[PDB]
Amino acid sequence: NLCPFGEVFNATRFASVYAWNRKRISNCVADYSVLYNSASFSTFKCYGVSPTKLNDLCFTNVYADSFVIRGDEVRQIAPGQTGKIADYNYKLPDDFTGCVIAWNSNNLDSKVGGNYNYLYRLFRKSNLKPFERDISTEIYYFPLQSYGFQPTNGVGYQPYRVVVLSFELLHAPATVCGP
Amino acid sequence: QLVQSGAEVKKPGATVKISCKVSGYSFSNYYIHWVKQAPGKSLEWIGYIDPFNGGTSDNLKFKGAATLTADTSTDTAYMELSSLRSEDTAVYYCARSEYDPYYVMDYWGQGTTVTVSSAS
Amino acid sequence: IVLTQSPFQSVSPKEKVTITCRASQSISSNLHWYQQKPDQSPKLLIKYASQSISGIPSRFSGSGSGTDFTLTINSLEAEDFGIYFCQQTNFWPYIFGQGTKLEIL
């Protein structure tokens, strides 16, 4: 069979940087070749494994995540960084095997005047540990401020939908990777 | 400024590694692109490595197992090309890159040919 | 994301000679352009197709709309021309068009 990467890549809406769409996935066969024959992203940076290799390697579980950031801010998403999204909203674990995809969101997440519905978490009582989620608005004020998504702003301040993958064959069984 | 290895020639079947060392800024905080330059033809992108993690976004077009590794100790990136073969007798270039999606390759290595023949 | 800008050039120098980056269906606002010299590691000329980086004489300007972009080398002489490659962007395999060699009288 398969299992629908569509609902994260080919979806409509987008989750915030603190409330982000976490999704364990398993018992599949996944045509990463689809991820390739898409040819629509901006960046497809793959840690601990090369895109051809993650095809022919055992996968027990996945941890797909869907959200958005402001363009430049995508730099924050890497092992060992600081910033709003880098620490105060997420963190890329340093035992990692999955890998990251991201691309512009202009005619889906922007418009004249801009969009507001996206809210970061600018402060925090605790910089979100690897992969953790503080979906509240705890004080440190409630730090969740929006970002403007304007066609005339900086391109690094244009909205970029990010979708991350995170693989885990700890000891869990088979049924991923396709072939 | 970037510095490669000298010009090289090899056999089919086996593999090779090439390198590129950096000077003048914070290496560990700047991508490095690897670009193939054809023999008497156009260009072709082959990948890039982040210096700090295996940010090896790898163009598929040729899957000669073109693996990227690096080292922040000596500030040198390594391109491990496998399956040396006819389509590879070209000039490979490291290239200075933006750290994230402002990608431009403006500072380069000397460019190194990796010739492929039937023998040495 | 295939590019097919301009096979080569053949024109009197000193003129406003245009090389026409015909982008495929993918309208990417971003781009780059690099100057290549014979057996010389090329260097990016036009950053983001509109901004100038430090160290470029203003002989060749870059512009364009959506997908289709252009580079107008204004008043180019017999001292500067070589090959000129176009550099795609965000679309994942950052393909490079088959370039723009520049020959002149």
**Contacts of B45 by beta carbon, 8 Å cutoff, 6+ apart:** B33, B35, B36, B59, C93, C94, C95, C96
Q: How far apart are CA B69 and CA B51, in angstroms?
A: 9
| Strand pairing class (C10-11; C103-104) | parallel
Fold exhibited by the domain C10-104: Immunoglobulin-like (2.60.40)
**Contacts of A160 by beta carbon, 8 Å cutoff, 6+ apart:** A42, A68, A69, A70, A71, A73, A74, A102, A103, A104, A105, B101
Among A34, A40, A152, the residue to mutate for chain C (most C Cβ within 10 A): A40
The residue whose two tokens read 């005619």 is A107
Q: How far apart are CA A101 and CA A42, in angstroms?
A: 8
Amino acid in the structure at residue A110: S
Q: Are residues A64 and A128 in the same domain?
A: no
For chain B, state the CA radius of gyration: 14
Query: Structure tokens of C83?
Result: 């090959």
CA quadruple C48, C53, C58, C59: dihedral sign = negative
Between B53, B67, B100, which is nearest A47 by CB? B53
Scanning C16-75 for CB atoms below 8 A from A yields 29-30, 48
Find chains touching chain A: ≥3 CB pairs under 8 Å. B, C
Q: Which of B47, B48, B77, B49 is nearest to B62 (CA)?
A: B47
Q: Are residues A89 and A174 in the same domain?
A: yes
Q: Are residues A128 and A167 in the same domain?
A: no
Q: Are B55 and B115 in contact (CB under 8 A)?
A: no
Q: Are residues A98 and A175 in the same domain?
A: yes
Q: Are residues A25 and A100 in the same domain?
A: yes
Q: Are residues A66 and A134 in the same domain?
A: no
The residue whose two tokens read 């989620």 is A133
Q: How far apart are CA A94 and CA A73, in angstroms?
A: 19
Find chains touching chain C: ≥3 CB pairs under 8 Å. A, B
Q: Are residues A18 and A39 in the same domain?
A: yes
A155–C29 CB contact, under 8 Å: yes
Q: How far apart are CA B104 and CA C44, in angstroms?
A: 7
DSSP A176: -
Domain locations in chain C?
10-104
Q: Which of B105, B95, B93, B44 is nearest to C98 (CA)?
A: B44
Comparing alpha-carbon positions, the chain C residue that sits nearest to A151 is C29
Query: Quick one: three-class SS letters along A2-55?
Result: CCCCHHHHCCCCCCCCCCCEEEEECCCCCCHHHHHHHCCCCEEEECCCCHHHHH
Q: Are A90 and A74 in contact (CB under 8 A)?
A: no
Comparing alpha-carbon positions, the chain A residue that sits nearest to B65 is A52
Comparing alpha-carbon positions, the chain C residue that sits nearest to A40 is C91
Number of domains in chain A: 2
Q: Are residues A123 and A160 in the same domain?
A: no
Q: Are A128 and A134 in contact (CB under 8 A)?
A: yes
Domain span at A139: 114-150
Strand order, beta sheet including C83-87:
C51-52, C40-47, C32-37, C83-87, C100-101
Q: Are residues A21 and A77 in the same domain?
A: yes
Counting one residue from A and one from B, how many pairs have CB atoms under 8 Å apart?
A: 45
Q: How far apart are CA A114 and CA A148, in angstroms?
A: 5
Q: Are residues A64 and A126 in the same domain?
A: no
Q: How far apart are CA B26 and CA B75, in angstroms?
A: 9
DSSP C93: S
User: In Å, what resolution does this model reach?
Assistant: 3.9
Walk me through the domains of chain B, giving residue ranges and CATH numbers. 2-116 (2.60.40.10)
Chain B CB contacts of A156 under 8 Å are: 101-102
Q: Are A116 and A146 in contact (CB under 8 A)?
A: yes
CA quadruple A167, A171, A172, A174: dihedral sign = positive
Chain C CB contacts of B42 under 8 Å are: 85, 96-99
Amino acid in the structure at residue C68: D
Q: How far apart are CA A178 and CA B3, in angstroms?
A: 41
Amino acid in the structure at residue B61: K
Q: What is the DSSP string of chain B?
A: -EEE---EEE-SSS-EEEEEEE-SS-GGGS-EEEEEE-TTS-EEEEEEE-SSS-------SS-S--EEEEETTTTEEEEEE-S--GGG-SEEEEEE--SSSS----SB---EEEEE-S--
**Contacts of A29 by beta carbon, 8 Å cutoff, 6+ apart:** A1, A2, A3, A175, A176, A177, A178, A179
C44–B106 CB contact, under 8 Å: yes
Find chains touching chain B: ≥3 CB pairs under 8 Å. A, C
C47–B104 CB contact, under 8 Å: yes
Q: Are residues A52 and A13 in the same domain?
A: yes
Query: Quick one: three-class SS letters along A79-142?
Result: CCCCCCCCCCCCCCCCCCCCEEEEEECHHHHCCCCCCCCCECCCCCCCCCCCCCCCCCCCCCCC
Q: Is C94 on the interface with B (CB under 8 A)?
A: yes
Q: Are residues A145 and A158 in the same domain?
A: no
Between C41, C90, C97, which is nearest B110 by CB? C41
Distances (CA, A) of A73 to A50, A60, A102, A166, C76: 24, 31, 11, 20, 40
Technique used by the depositors: cryo-EM
